[PDB]
Coordinates of C-alpha atoms and ligand atoms in Angstrom, one line a residue:
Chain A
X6 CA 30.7 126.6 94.5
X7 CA 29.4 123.4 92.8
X8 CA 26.5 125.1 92.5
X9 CA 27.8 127.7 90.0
X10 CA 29.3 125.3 87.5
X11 CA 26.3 122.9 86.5
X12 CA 24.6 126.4 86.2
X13 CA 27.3 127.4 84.2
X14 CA 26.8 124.1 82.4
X15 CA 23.6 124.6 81.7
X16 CA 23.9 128.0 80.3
X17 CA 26.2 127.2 77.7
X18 CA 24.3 124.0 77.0
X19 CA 21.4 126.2 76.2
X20 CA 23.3 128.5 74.0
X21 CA 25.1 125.8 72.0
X22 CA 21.9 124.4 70.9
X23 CA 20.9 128.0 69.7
X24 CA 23.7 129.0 67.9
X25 CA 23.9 125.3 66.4
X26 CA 21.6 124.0 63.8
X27 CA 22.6 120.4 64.0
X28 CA 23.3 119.0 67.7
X29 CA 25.5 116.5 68.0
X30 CA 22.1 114.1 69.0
X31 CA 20.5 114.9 65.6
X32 CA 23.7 113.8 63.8
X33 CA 23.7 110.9 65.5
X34 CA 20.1 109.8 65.0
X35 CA 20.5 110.5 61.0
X36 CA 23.7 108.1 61.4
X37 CA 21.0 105.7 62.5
X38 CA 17.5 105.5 62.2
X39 CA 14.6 107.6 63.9
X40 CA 15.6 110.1 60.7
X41 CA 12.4 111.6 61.6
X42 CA 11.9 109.1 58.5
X43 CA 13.6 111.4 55.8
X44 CA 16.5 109.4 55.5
X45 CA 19.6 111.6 54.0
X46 CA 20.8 111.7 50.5
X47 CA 23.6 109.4 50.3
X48 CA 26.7 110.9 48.0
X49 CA 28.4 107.7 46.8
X50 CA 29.7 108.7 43.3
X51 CA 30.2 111.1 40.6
X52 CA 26.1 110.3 39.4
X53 CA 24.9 110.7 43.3
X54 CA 27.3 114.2 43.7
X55 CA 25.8 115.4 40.4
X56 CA 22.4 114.6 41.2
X57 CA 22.9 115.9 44.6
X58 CA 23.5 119.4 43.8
X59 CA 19.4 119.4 43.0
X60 CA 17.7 117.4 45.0
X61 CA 19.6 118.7 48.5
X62 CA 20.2 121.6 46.4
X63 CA 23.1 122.7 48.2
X64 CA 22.9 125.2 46.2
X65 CA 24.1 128.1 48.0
X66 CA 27.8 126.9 47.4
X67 CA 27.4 125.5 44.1
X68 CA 25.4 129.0 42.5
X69 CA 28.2 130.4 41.2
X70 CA 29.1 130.2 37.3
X71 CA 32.0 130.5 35.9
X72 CA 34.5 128.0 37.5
X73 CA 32.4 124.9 38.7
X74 CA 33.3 122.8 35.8
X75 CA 35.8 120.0 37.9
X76 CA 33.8 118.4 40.6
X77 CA 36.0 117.5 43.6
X78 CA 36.8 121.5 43.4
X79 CA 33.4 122.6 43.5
X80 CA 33.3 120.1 46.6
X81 CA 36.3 122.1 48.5
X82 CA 34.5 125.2 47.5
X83 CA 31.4 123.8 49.4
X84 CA 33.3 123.0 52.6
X85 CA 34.8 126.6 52.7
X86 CA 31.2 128.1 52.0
X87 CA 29.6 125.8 54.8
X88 CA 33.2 126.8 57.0
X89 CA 32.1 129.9 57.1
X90 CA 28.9 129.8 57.9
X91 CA 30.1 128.0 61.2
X92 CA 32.5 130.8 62.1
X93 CA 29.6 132.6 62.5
X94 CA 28.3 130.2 64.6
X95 CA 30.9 129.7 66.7
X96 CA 31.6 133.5 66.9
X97 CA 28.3 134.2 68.2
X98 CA 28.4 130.9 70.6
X99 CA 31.6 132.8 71.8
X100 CA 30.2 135.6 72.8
X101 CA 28.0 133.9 75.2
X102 CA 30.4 132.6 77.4
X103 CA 31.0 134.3 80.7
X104 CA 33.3 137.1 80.5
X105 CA 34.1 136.7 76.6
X106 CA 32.8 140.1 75.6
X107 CA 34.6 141.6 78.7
X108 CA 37.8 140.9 77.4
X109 CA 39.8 143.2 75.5
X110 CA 38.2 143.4 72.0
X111 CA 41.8 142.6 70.1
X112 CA 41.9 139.3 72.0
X113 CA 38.7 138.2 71.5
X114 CA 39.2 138.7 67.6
X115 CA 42.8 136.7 68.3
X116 CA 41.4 133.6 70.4
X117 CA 38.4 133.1 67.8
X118 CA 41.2 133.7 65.0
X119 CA 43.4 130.9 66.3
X120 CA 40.4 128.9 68.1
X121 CA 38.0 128.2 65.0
X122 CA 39.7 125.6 63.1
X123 CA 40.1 123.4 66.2
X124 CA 36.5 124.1 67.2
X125 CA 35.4 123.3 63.5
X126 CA 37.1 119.7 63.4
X127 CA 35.4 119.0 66.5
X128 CA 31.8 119.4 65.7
X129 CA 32.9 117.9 62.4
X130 CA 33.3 115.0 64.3
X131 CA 29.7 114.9 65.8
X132 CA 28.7 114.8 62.1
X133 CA 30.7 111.8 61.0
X134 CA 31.4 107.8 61.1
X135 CA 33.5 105.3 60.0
X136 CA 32.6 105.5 56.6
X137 CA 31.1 108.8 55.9
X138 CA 30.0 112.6 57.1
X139 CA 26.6 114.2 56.8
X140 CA 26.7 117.5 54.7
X141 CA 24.2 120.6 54.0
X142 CA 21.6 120.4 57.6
X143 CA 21.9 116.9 57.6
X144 CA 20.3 116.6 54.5
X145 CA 23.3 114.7 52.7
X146 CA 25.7 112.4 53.8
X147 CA 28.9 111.9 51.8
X148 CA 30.8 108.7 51.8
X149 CA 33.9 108.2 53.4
X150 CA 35.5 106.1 50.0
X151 CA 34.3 108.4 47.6
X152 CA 36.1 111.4 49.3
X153 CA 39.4 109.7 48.8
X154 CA 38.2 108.5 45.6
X155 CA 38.8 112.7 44.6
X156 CA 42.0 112.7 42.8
X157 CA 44.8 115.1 43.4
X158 CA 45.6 116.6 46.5
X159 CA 41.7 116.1 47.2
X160 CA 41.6 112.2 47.6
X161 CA 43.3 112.1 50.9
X162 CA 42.6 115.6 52.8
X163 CA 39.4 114.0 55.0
X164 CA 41.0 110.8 55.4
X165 CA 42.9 112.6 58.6
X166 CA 40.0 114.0 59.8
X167 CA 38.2 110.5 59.5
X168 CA 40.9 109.0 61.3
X169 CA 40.3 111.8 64.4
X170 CA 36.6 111.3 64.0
X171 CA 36.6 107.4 65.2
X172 CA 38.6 108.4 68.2
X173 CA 37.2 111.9 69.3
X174 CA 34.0 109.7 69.1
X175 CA 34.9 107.0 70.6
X176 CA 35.1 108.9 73.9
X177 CA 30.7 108.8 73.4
X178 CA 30.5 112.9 74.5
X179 CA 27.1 114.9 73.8
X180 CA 26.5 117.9 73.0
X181 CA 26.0 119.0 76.7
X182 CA 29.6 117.8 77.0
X183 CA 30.6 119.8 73.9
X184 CA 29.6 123.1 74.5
X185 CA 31.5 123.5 77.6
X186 CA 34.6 121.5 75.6
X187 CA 34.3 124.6 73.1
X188 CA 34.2 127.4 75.4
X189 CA 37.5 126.0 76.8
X190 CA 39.3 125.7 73.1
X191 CA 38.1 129.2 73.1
X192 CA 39.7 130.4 76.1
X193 CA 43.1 129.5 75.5
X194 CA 46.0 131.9 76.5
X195 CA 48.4 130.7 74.4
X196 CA 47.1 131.7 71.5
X197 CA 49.8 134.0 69.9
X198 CA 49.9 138.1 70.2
X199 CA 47.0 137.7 72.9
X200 CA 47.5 140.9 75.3
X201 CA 45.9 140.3 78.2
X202 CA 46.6 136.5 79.3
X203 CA 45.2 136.7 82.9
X204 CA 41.7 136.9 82.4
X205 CA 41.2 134.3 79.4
X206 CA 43.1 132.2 81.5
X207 CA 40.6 132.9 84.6
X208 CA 38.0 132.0 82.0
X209 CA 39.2 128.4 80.8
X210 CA 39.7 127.5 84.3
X211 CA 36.1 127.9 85.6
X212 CA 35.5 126.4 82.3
X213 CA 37.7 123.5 83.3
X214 CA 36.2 123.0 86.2
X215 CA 33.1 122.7 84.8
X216 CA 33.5 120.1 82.2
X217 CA 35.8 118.1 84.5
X218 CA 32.4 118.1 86.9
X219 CA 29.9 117.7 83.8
X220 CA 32.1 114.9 82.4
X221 CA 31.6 113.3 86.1
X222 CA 27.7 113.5 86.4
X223 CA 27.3 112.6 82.8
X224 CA 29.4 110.0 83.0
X225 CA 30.0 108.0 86.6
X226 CA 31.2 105.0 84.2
X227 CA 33.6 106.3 82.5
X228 CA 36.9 107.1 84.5
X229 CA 39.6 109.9 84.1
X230 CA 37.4 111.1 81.0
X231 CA 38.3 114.6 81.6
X232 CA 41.8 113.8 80.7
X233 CA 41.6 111.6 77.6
X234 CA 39.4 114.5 76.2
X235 CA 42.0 117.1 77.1
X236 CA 44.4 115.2 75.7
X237 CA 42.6 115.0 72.6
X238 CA 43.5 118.6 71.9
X239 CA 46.9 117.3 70.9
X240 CA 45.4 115.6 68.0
X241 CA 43.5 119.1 67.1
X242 CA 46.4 121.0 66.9
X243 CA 48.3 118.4 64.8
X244 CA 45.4 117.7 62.2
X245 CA 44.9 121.4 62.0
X246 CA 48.6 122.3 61.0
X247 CA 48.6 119.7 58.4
X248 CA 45.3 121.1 57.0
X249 CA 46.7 123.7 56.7
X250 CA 50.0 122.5 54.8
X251 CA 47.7 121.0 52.3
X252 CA 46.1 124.0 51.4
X253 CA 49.9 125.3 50.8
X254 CA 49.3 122.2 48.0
X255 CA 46.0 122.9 46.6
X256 CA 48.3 125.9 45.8
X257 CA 49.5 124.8 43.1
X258 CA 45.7 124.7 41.5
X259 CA 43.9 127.0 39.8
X260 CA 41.0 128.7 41.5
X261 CA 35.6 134.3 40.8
X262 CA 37.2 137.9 41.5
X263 CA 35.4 138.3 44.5
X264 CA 34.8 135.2 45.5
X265 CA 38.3 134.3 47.5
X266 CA 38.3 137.8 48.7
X267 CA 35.5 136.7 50.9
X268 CA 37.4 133.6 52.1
Chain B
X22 CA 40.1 111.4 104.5
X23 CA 42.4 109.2 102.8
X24 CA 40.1 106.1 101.7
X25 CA 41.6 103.1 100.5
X26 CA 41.7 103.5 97.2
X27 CA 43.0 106.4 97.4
X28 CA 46.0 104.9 99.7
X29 CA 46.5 102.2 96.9
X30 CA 47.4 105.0 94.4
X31 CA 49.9 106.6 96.7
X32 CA 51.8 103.9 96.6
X33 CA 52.0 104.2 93.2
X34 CA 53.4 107.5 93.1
X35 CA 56.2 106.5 95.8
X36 CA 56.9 103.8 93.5
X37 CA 57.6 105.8 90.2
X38 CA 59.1 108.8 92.3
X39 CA 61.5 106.2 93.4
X40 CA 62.3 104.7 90.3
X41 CA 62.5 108.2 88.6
X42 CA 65.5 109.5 90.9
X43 CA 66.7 106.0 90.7
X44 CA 67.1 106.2 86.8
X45 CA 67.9 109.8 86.1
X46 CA 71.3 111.2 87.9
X47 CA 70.3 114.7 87.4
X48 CA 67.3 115.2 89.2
X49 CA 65.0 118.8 89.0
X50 CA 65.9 119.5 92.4
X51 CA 69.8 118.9 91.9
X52 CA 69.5 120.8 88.4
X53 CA 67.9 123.6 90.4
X54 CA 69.9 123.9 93.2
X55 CA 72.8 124.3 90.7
X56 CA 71.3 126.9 88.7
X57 CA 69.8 128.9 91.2
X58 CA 73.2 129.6 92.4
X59 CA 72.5 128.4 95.9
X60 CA 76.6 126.7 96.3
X61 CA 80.0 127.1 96.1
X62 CA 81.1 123.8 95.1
X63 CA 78.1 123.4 92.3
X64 CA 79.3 126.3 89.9
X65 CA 78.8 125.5 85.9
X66 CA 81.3 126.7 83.5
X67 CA 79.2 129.2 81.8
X68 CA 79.6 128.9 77.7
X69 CA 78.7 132.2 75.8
X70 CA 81.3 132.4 73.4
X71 CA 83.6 130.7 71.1
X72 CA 86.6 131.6 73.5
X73 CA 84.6 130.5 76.6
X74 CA 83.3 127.6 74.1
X75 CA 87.4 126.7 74.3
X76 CA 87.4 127.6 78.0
X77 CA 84.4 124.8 78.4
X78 CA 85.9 122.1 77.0
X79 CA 89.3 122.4 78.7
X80 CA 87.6 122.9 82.5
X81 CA 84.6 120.9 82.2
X82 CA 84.6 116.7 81.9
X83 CA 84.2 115.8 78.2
X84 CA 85.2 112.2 77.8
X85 CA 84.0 113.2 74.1
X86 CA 80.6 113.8 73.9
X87 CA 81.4 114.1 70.4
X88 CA 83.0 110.9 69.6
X89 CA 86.2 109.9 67.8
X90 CA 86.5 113.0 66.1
X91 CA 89.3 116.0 66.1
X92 CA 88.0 119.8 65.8
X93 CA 85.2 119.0 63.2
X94 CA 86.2 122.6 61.3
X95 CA 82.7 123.6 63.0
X96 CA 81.6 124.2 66.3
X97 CA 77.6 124.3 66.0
X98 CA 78.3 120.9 65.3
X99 CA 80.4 119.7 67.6
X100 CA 77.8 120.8 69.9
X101 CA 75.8 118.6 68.1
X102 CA 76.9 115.7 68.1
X103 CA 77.6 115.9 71.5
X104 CA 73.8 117.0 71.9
X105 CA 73.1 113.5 69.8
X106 CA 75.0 111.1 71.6
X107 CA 73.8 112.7 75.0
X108 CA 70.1 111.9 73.4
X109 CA 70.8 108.5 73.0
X110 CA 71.9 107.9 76.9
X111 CA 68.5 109.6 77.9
X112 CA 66.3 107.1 75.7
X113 CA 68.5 104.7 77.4
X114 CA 67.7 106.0 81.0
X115 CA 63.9 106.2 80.2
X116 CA 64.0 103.1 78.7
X117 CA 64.8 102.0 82.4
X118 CA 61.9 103.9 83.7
X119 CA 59.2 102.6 81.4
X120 CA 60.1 98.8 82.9
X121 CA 59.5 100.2 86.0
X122 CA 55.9 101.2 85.3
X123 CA 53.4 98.7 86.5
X124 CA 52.3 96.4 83.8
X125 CA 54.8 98.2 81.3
X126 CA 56.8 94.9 80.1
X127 CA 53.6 92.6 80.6
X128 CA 53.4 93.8 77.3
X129 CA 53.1 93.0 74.0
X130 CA 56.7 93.3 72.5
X131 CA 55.8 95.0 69.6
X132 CA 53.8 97.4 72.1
X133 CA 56.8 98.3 74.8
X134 CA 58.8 99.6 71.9
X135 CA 56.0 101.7 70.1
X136 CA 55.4 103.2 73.4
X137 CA 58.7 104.3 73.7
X138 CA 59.7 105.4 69.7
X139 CA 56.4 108.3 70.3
X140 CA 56.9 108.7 74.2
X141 CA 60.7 109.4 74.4
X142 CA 60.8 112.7 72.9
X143 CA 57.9 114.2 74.3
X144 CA 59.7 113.4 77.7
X145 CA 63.3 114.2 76.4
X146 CA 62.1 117.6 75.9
X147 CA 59.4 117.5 79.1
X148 CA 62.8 116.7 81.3
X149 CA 65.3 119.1 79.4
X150 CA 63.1 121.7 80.8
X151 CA 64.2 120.9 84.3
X152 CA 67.9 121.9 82.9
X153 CA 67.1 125.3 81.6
X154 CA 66.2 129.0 82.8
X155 CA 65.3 131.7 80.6
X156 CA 68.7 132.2 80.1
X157 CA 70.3 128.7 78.9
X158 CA 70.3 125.1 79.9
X159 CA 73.2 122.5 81.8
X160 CA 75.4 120.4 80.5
X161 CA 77.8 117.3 81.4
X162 CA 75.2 116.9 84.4
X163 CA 75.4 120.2 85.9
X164 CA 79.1 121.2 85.3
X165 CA 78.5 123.4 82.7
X166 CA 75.8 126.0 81.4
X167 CA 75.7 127.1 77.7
X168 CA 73.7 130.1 77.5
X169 CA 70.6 130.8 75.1
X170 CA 72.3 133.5 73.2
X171 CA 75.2 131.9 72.0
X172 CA 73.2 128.7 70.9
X173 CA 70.6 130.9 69.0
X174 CA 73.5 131.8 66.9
X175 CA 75.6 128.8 66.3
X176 CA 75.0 129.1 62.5
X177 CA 72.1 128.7 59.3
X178 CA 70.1 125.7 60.7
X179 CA 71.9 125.1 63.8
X180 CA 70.8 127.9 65.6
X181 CA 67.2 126.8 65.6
X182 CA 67.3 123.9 67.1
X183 CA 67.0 125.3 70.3
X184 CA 64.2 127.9 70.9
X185 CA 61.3 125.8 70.7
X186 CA 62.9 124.0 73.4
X187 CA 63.5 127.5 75.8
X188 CA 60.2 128.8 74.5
X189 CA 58.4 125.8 76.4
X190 CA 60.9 125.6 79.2
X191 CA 59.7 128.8 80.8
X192 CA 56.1 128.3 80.4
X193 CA 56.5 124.6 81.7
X194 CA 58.7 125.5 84.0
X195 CA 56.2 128.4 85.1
X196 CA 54.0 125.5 86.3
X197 CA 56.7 124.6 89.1
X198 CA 56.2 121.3 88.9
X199 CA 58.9 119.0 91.2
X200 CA 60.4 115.5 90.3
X201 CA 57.3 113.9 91.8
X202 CA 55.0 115.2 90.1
X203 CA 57.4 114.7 86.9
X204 CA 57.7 111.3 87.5
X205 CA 54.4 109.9 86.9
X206 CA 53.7 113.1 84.4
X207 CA 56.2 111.4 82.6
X208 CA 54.8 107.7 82.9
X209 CA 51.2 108.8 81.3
X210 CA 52.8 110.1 78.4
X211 CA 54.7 106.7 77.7
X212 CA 51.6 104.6 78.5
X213 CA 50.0 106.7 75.6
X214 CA 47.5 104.3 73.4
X215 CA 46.6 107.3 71.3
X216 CA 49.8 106.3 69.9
X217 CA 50.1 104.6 66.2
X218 CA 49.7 100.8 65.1
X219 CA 49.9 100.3 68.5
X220 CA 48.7 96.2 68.5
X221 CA 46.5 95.8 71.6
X222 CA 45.4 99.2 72.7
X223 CA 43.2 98.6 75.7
X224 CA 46.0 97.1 78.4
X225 CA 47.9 100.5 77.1
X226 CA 44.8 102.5 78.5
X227 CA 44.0 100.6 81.6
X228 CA 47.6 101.1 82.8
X229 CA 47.5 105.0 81.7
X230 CA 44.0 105.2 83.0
X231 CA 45.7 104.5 86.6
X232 CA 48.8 106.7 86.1
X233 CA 46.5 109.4 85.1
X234 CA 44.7 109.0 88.5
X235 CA 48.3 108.8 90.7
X236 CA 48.7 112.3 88.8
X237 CA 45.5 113.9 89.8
X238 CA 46.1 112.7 93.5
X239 CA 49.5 113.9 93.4
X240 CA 49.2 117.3 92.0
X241 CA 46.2 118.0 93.8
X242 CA 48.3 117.0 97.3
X243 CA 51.5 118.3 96.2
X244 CA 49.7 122.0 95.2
X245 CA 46.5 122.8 97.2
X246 CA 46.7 126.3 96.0
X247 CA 47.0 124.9 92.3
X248 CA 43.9 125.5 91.2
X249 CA 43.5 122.9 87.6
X250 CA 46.7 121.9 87.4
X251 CA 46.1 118.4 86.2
X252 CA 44.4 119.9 83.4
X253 CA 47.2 122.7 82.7
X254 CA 49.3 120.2 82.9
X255 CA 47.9 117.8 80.2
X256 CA 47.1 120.7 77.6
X257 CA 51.1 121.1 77.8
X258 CA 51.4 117.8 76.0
X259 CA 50.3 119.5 72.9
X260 CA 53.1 121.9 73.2
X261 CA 55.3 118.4 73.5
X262 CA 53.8 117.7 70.0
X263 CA 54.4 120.9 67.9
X264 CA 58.8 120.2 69.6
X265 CA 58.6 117.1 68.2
X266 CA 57.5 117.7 65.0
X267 CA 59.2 120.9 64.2
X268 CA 62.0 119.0 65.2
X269 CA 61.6 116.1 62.7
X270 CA 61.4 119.2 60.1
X271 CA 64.8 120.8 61.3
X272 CA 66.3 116.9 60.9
X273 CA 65.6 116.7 57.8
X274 CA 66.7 120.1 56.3
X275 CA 69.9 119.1 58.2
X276 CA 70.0 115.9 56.7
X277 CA 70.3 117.6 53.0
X278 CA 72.3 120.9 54.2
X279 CA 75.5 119.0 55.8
X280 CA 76.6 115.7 53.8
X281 CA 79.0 114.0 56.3
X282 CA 77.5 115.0 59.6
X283 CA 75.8 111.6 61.2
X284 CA 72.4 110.6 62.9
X285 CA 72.5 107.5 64.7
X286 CA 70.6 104.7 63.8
X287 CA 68.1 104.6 67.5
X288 CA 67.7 108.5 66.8
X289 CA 66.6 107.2 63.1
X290 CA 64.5 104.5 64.2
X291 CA 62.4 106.7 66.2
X292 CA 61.7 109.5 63.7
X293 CA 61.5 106.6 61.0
X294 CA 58.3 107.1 59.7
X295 CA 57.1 109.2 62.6
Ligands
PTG25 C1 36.6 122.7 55.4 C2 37.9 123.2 54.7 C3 38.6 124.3 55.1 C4 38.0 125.3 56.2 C5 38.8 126.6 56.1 C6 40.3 126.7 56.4 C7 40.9 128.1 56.8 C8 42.4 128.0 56.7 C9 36.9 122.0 56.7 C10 37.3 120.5 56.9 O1 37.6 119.7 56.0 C11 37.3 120.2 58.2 C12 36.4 121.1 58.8 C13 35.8 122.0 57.8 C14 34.4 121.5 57.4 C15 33.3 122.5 57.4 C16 32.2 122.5 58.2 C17 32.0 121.4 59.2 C18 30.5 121.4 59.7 C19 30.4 121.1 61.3 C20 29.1 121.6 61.9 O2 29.0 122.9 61.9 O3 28.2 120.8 62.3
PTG26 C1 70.7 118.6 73.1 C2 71.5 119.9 73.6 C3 71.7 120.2 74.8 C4 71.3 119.3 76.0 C5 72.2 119.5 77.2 C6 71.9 118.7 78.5 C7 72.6 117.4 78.8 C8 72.6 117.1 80.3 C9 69.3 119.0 72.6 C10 68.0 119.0 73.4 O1 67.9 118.7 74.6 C11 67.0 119.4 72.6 C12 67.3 119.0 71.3 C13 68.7 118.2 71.4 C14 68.6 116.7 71.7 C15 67.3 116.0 71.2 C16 67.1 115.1 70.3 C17 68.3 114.6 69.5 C18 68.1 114.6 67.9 C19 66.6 114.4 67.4 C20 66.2 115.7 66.7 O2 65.3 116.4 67.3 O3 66.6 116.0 65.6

């Protein structure tokens, strides 16, 4: 039925870009040159951050009074404003795959739950280089040396993700690559207290099949590509545990009473 | 059907199944054939208890496991150390192996033992699957069989060492996989590349690049009805990972908790700065 996955391709291509603002070919471009000719406001420093609250005005995470007054901690603020913003995206991405909102409703709440994070770091990646990562629609980009140039537990906390970034990328995937990738990180049955195993797992392998057969049309060069991708999962998991042992450190900061209710 | 290239990577598996069994005494299929019961003259000693624990050590082979030592005061140790020095023999045994791979000691020096320090642990535990059940795992190479409940109660850190190990066991084990299909399973995941300050990284991935492709053949002729095993099969190497590292963490503790128990410097040298 080789007819059914590059439909099946197709359809989640065409929802990806939907529920996506930014491809993953618009990152790239802005990494670039054909900007569209609005080149991106480059964050290098403290003066570039400051003056890039206005002119991006990224303003949407930054509002809020009473607390931004420490820069690298209005920063994290912003990626957990932006993060969830994306959890909508992915959520309603999720819920165009094939047989997602059949499943049991409890299990679809666990598998986006426990499947967000890895998805997150993996878009993040279609939005970064060597040396830095574009923020806020593409508008900014923030360098690479001035996010470990933050201080405390802030200096190195993207340096991992920097170091996934130049591998996941070096693998050269698109975005019609990446939508199917996602579906499968979606569809994952061992994603702890799930209830009804058999039909997620019927899922990721149709999925499975279709990347493994998008990943050969899309690339006839590039050999056993299916593979090193799944195997990049392993990295996922690792960098998202550790993330998530720093955050056990930024616990031991200070920082609004309804503002981390949200998050 | 079979075109040449093809044929060529056949040969390849052949070659790693045969230097598999020819490196590991305790094959899947032996380890199965014990533990599914199916003899009268391959019955393990089962351990569940202290008394049994004494039981074990009288019937079963121990030319100590646990070296130079009288009754250290402890038993969740003894069982330790024994399931130390028994970890050192199996880096030994797929040290063997990896010179078997094709291209493996062409290799950068620095390289071969990289390989190795990140690859023999996801394969000691990928392997130690093959000697348990949902009910507990062999030991002295089949003679014995300490069960699951009595290890998950050994004592404070002791008793945790183990789960992680059963918790994959049954789900790798669920993929039925034979010593085949373990065998070149187990050479990707040497001939990593992904793996740290590896020097030169691209003969790592040519080499993998081709044991990935004896694995696809293989699984795919070894289980028709297996419908994306490969694939199953490589996410599982994540689940190698999280063993790993949880069990750097339980080291560790360990290493703090008891003041004269002993690692051993090649079980050091692999965790140092892992
Ligand atoms: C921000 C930090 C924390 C996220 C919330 C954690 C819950 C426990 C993350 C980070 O540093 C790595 C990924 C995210 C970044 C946020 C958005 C990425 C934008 C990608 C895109 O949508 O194109
Ligand atoms: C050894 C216990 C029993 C193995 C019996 C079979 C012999 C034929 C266990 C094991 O397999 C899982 C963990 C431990 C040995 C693994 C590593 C040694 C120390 C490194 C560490 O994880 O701390």
């Amino acid at each position: 039925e080789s007819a059914d996955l590059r439909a099946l391709a197709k359809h989640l291509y065409d929802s990806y870009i939907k529920s996506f603002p930014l491809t993953k070919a618009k990152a790239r471009a802005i990494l670039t040159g054909k900007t569209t000719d609005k080149s991106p406001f480059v964050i290098y420093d403290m003066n570039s951050l400051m003056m890039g609250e206005d002119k991006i005005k990224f303003k949407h995470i930054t509002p809020l009074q009473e607390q931004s007054k420490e820069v690298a901690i209005r920063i994290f603020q912003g990626c957990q404003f932006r993060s969830v913003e994306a959890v909508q995206e992915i959520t309603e991405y999720a819920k165009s795959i094939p047989g997602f909102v059949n499943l049991d409703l409890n299990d679809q709440v666990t598998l986006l739950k426990y499947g967000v994070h890895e998805i997150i770091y993996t878009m993040l990646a279609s939005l970064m280089n060597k040396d830095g990562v574009l923020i806020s629609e593409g508008q900014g980009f923030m360098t690479r040396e001035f996010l470990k140039s933050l201080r405390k537990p802030f200096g190195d906390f993207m340096e991992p993700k920097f170091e996934f970034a130049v591998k996941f990328n070096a693998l050269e995937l698109d975005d019609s690559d990446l939508a199917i990738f996602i579906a499968v990180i979606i569809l994952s049955g061992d994603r702890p207290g799930l209830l009804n195993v058999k039909p997620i797992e019927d899922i990721q392998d149709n999925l499975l099949q279709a990347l493994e057969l998008q990943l050969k049309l899309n690339h006839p060069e590039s050999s056993q590509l299916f593979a090193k991708l799944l195997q990049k999962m392993t990295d996922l998991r690792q960098i998202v545990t550790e993330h998530v042992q720093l955050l056990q450190v930024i616990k031991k900061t200070e920082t609004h009473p309804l503002l981390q209710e949200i998050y």
